Design an enzyme around this catalytic site. Structure first.
Site, PDB file in Angstrom:
ATOM      1  N   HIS A   1       0.648  -1.149  -0.074  1.00 13.60           N
ATOM      2  CA  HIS A   1      -0.246   0.240   0.060  1.00 13.60           C
ATOM      3  C   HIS A   1       1.001   1.033   0.143  1.00 13.60           C
ATOM      4  O   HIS A   1       0.362   2.824   0.132  1.00 13.60           O
ATOM      5  CB  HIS A   1      -0.908   0.544   1.200  1.00 13.60           C
ATOM      6  CG  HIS A   1      -0.536   0.366   2.480  1.00 13.60           C
ATOM      7  ND1 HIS A   1      -0.243  -0.673   3.543  1.00 13.60           N
ATOM      8  CD2 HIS A   1      -0.187   1.395   2.825  1.00 13.60           C
ATOM      9  CE1 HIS A   1       0.224  -0.491   4.694  1.00 13.60           C
ATOM     10  NE2 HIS A   1       0.952   1.282   4.602  1.00 13.60           N
TER      11      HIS A   1
ATOM     12  N   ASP B   1      -0.054  -7.529   0.887  1.00 17.80           N
ATOM     13  CA  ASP B   1       0.265  -6.095   1.283  1.00 17.80           C
ATOM     14  C   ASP B   1       1.222  -5.641   1.185  1.00 17.80           C
ATOM     15  O   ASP B   1       2.254  -5.746   2.183  1.00 17.80           O
ATOM     16  CB  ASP B   1       0.316  -5.809   2.548  1.00 17.80           C
ATOM     17  CG  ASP B   1      -0.270  -3.758   3.056  1.00 17.80           C
ATOM     18  OD1 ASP B   1      -0.621  -3.201   3.429  1.00 17.80           O
ATOM     19  OD2 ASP B   1       0.926  -3.271   1.766  1.00 17.80           O
TER      20      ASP B   1
ATOM     21  N   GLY C   1       2.770   5.988   8.781  1.00 18.88           N
ATOM     22  CA  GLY C   1       3.785   6.110   8.536  1.00 18.88           C
ATOM     23  C   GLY C   1       4.683   5.008   9.178  1.00 18.88           C
ATOM     24  O   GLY C   1       5.861   4.497   9.144  1.00 18.88           O
TER      25      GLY C   1
ATOM     26  N   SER D   1       3.929   2.157   8.714  1.00 17.33           N
ATOM     27  CA  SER D   1       3.732   1.033   7.497  1.00 17.33           C
ATOM     28  C   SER D   1       4.731   0.912   6.914  1.00 17.33           C
ATOM     29  O   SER D   1       5.825   1.119   6.255  1.00 17.33           O
ATOM     30  CB  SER D   1       2.662   1.376   6.306  1.00 17.33           C
ATOM     31  OG  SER D   1       1.612   1.686   7.036  1.00 17.33           O
TER      32      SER D   1
ATOM     33  N   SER E   1       1.586  -3.925   8.091  1.00 20.51           N
ATOM     34  CA  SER E   1       0.405  -3.269   7.195  1.00 20.51           C
ATOM     35  C   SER E   1      -1.000  -2.480   7.820  1.00 20.51           C
ATOM     36  O   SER E   1      -1.005  -1.318   6.768  1.00 20.51           O
ATOM     37  CB  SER E   1      -0.549  -4.871   7.143  1.00 20.51           C
ATOM     38  OG  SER E   1      -1.340  -4.396   5.929  1.00 20.51           O
TER      39      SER E   1
END
Length: 183
Positions: free
Chosen positions: A32, A56, A135, A137, A152
């Site tokens: 993502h 992801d 942030g 992620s 994720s």
């Protein structure tokens, strides 16, 4: 420039995500974070495969002047050596490194969980009690010195607690025929 797990990188100037782990040719992170062909800075790189939703994960290819280290930032001025990627069972203590909240730990509470983001459903996720904020992620999840997954998403925050889900690393390595850097 040194690539270390848990550090911020930017995409179109935005610090949207964190580095997952160094692999031959670059680093892995959350799908993502960006789409194939998107360029990054800190380090300079290009997304060379991205799967989201459903999965992801993504791989960012880096080139010259970028040192790929088998380390994760502990956000206390040290680094954690990444020794392998053997999956830890449910109940394991895990710690996450991410560029917004730093180093936070919890436990794995489920495997193969599904979540539904605005963009769609992602399956096959590691569910944990670790907190995360945007942030974080793409950042590293370790059980000791063993890479487990990349951040994720989830619910809550690091002030009051939350639930965070991670894309396991093994399917990413398999998807792109990648090897984790150890040394």
């Amino acid at each position: 420039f040194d690539v270390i797990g848990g550090n911020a990188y930017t995409i179109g100037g935005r610090s949207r995500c964190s580095i997952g782990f160094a692999v031959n040719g670059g680093f892995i992170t959350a799908g993502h974070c960006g789409r194939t062909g998107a360029t990054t800075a800190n380090p300079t790189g290009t997304f060379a495969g991205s799967s989201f939703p459903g999965n992801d994960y993504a791989f960012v290819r880096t080139g010259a002047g970028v040192n790929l280290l088998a380390q994760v930032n502990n956000y206390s001025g040290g680094r954690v050596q990444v020794a392998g990627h053997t999956a830890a069972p449910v109940g394991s203590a895990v710690c996450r490194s991410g560029s917004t909240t730093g180093w936070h730990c919890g436990t794995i509470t489920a495997l193969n969980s599904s979540v539904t983001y605005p963009e769609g459903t992602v399956r096959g996720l590691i569910r944990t009690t670790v907190c995360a904020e945007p942030g974080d992620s793409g950042g590293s999840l370790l059980a000791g010195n063993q890479a487990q997954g990349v951040t994720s998403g989830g619910s809550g925050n690091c002030r009051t607690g939350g639930t965070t889900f991670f894309q396991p690393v093994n399917p990413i390595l398999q998807a792109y025929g990648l090897r984790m850097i150890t040394t």
